């Protein structure tokens, strides 16, 4: 699973996610990647999110939209919303993985509950940051 989230110079958010799925999966199984609100979501009012990990749990928890709803309705910060979804609610359903998220104010979060998440981010005109491990 791969993904990207961006905030452009016009203040627009977007998200995209792509995957080959899980090794040895049942043919015809569908995880969170192609499901709006599960593996991918963007809304200028809140956040752009791309998710990777246990597909069935990201769907059941609507992880990507839940970040947006926790911020928009719950008043949580992006950091608080990311902590709640990735470190509390996803493990409570037996889910492991992470997500990348940018809010309309340009805050960035890359939470994950796994050993690693291949990740990078950077502000325009600045030097990128990269990560694999915790």
């Amino acid at each position: 699973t791969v993904g990207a989230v961006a905030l452009d110079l016009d203040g627009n958010l977007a998200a995209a996610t792509s995957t080959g799925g899980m090794t040895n999966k049942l043919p015809g199984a569908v995880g969170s990647t192609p499901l709006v609100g599960a593996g991918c979501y963007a809304n200028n009012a809140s956040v752009a999110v791309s998710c990777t990990g246990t597909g069935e749990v990201f769907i059941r928890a609507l992880a990507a939209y839940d970040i947006a709803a926790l911020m928009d309705y719950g008043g949580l910060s992006l950091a608080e919303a990311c902590e709640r979804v990735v470190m509390e609610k996803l493990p409570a359903l037996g889910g492991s993985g992470g997500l990348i998220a940018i809010d309309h104010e340009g805050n960035v979060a890359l939470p994950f509950n796994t050993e690693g998440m291949y990740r990078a981010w950077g502000y325009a005109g600045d030097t990128p940051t990269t990560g694999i491990y915790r």
Partner: protein
């Protein structure tokens, strides 16, 4: 203006990997985020930036999307992608596609040229071919690393 990307979360173990092996991943991530940063700086749309970043992560055989996709139980590839525009709340998605080199480009096509958010399987493929997207053999996705997994 800012971009973030990911190439998957899971049980990546340092005891298993050399620094040279890690740096292949770091180099690929750095090159893609840099391309996105340069597009954002040039005033490209968030939509076009996330599309290109994910297209480059599909192309990169190190990551489980497009080229380098994992195998099903039947030693096939079934790919999925989604794209969403926070300005219009329009979205496009494909699932269970095997003959499209860049699922995120098929997802953008569904968003832009269909009345649907999502299309699946041969129907998604036929939709894309009818609109001039090329057919590939799912052999192009196969790597030794993912097979050995």
């Amino acid at each position: 203006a800012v971009i973030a990307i990911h190439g998957g979360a899971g049980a990546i173990s340092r005891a298993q990997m050399s620094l040279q092996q890690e740096l292949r991943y770091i180099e690929a991530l750095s090159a893609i985020v840099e391309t996105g940063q340069k597009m954002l700086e040039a005033g490209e749309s968030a939509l076009d930036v996330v599309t290109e970043a994910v297209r480059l992560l599909e192309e990169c055989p190190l990551f489980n999307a497009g080229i380098g996709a994992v195998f099903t139980r039947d030693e096939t590839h079934e790919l999925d992608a989604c794209v969403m525009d926070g300005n219009t709340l329009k979205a496009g998605a494909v699932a269970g596609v095997s003959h499209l080199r860049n699922p995120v480009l098929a997802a953008r096509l569904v968003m832009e040229q269909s009345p649907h958010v999502m299309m699946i399987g041969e129907g998604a493929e036929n939709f894309a071919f009818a609109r001039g997207m090329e057919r590939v053999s799912p052999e192009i996705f196969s790597t030794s690393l993912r097979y050995e997994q």
